[PDB]
Amino acid sequence: PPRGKTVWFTGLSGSGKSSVAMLVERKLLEKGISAYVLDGDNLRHGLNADLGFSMADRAENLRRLSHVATLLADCGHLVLVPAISPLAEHRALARKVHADAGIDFFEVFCDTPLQDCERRDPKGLYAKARAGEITHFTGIDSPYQRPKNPDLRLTPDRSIDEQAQEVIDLLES
Ligand SMILES: Nc1ncnc2c1ncn2[C@@H]1O[C@H](COP(=O)(O)OP(=O)(O)NP(=O)(O)O)[C@@H](O)[C@H]1O
Ligand SMILES: Nc1ncnc2c1ncn2[C@@H]1O[C@H](COP(=O)(O)OS(=O)(=O)O)[C@@H](O)[C@H]1O
Ligand SMILES: [Mg+2]
């Protein structure tokens, strides 16, 4: 089986990473293309349950995810990784792990403004952060460094279904 590839999705909480990743996975599977989603939040309940949201713990979370992604890619899967990845150094590290493993790596920036993410607020975390009930929350009191040159920038200009089709177009180009 030919080696797979990784699509790494960075962005604020509530920017649409997980939604887009899951729809891409569905669209690919339906077409007989093996895809799998390694979602930062879901994996923080198992593999990464020992980690919090300190910058050191986020780096570790993302290091681990990058190695798990290369291994599933080596197996032939198209791997989708929705994780905030707030620091440039976090994306650089993931990119390096992939380079070292000889797996193609695509960076997708879900560029939804903070105001819109907050206006969405699907898990109530922004409201908690602003009330001081959660600390070190990305975009509020923990940094997000915007990617300078992502392979694809998704904006809230179209449906999730269309955004998923743009990721597929990127892969198929
Ligand atoms: N293109 C879009 N059009 C309309 N709504 C959208 C779009 N993209 C995302 N959303 C909405 O934004 C909400 C947050 O999406 P989600 O995919 O959970 O974000 P995330 O980046 O994975 N968040 P987090 O897990 O906190 O890092 C979803 O409930 C979507 O309904
Ligand atoms: N302090 C926090 N900062 C950011 N996201 C948080 C925080 N606490 C809980 N979360 C939730 O945890 C998930 C972010 O986890 P990751 O994507 O794994 O983060 S990362 O920074 O290490 O890349 C999101 O689904 C988010 O809703
Ligand atoms: Mg998510």
Residue numbers in the entry: 440 to 612
What text appears in the publication on this structure?
The structure of CysC is characterized by the canonical α/β-purine nucleotide binding fold, consisting of a five-stranded parallel β-sheet which is flanked on both sides by two α-helices. Structural features typical of APS kinases of this fold family, including the P-loop required for ATP binding (residues 452–458 in CysC), the conserved LDGD motif (residues 477–480) and the lid region (residues 552–581) above the P-loop which closes upon substrate binding, are also found in CysC.
The structure of CysC with the non-hydrolyzable ATP analogue AMP-PNP, Mg2+, and APS bound in the active site provides a view of the Michaelis complex in the reaction sequence. The bound ligands AMP-PNP and APS are well defined in electron density and their interactions with CysC are, with the exception of the γ-phosphate group of AMP-PNP, essentially identical to those observed in the CysC•ADP•APS complex. The γ-phosphate extends from the ADP moiety towards the ribose group of APS, and the phosphorous atom is about 3.4 Å away from the 3’ hydroxyl oxygen, the acceptor of the phosphoryl group. An important contribution to the binding of AMP-PNP is the Mg2+ ion that is bound in octahedral coordination geometry in the active site. The ligand sphere of this ion consists of one oxygen atom each from the β- and γ-phosphate groups, the side chain oxygen of Ser457 and three water molecules (metal-ligand distances 2.0–2.2 Å). In the structure of the CysC•AMP-PNP•APS complex, helix α5 is shifted by about 2.2 Å closer to the nucleotide binding site compared to the structure of the CysC•ADP complex. The side chain of Asp478 forms a hydrogen bond to a water molecule that is ligand of the Mg2+ ion. In addition the conserved side chain of Asp480, close to the 3’ hydroxyl group of the acceptor substrate APS, could act as a catalytic base in deprotonation of the O3’ hydroxyl group.
